Amino acid sequence: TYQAVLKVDNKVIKVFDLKKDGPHYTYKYEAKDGDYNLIEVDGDRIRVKEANCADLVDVRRGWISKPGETPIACLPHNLFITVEASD
Numbered sequence: 001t002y003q004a005v006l007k008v009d010n011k012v013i014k015v016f017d018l019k020k021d022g023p024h025y026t027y028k029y030e031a032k033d034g035d036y037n038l039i040e041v042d043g044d045r046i047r048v049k050e051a052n053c054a055d056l057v058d059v060r061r062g063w064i065s066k067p068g069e070t071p072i073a074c075l076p077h078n079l080f081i082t083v084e085a086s087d
């Protein structure tokens, strides 16, 4: 079993459990300045579904689910999603 760690501005703000038979939902990160990234968890996988950064690189990256995968990164918003083991 794995977990996704969402970090923004060097603060870990949310840890999502990645369960194969798990729920499907969205979580919105939105800063006071209007910068936002919409996280979508679908069972055991996670992505940024939508964002308003200038290049949408994190959106275009799509889903990750395994610890070794390159983290989802929105560099303009200083936001990162990495997958890791339940330790």
Ligand SMILES: [Zn+2]
Binding pocket: 051, 053, 054, 055, 056, 057, 058, 059, 073, 074, 075, 076, 077
């Ligand atoms: Zn981005």
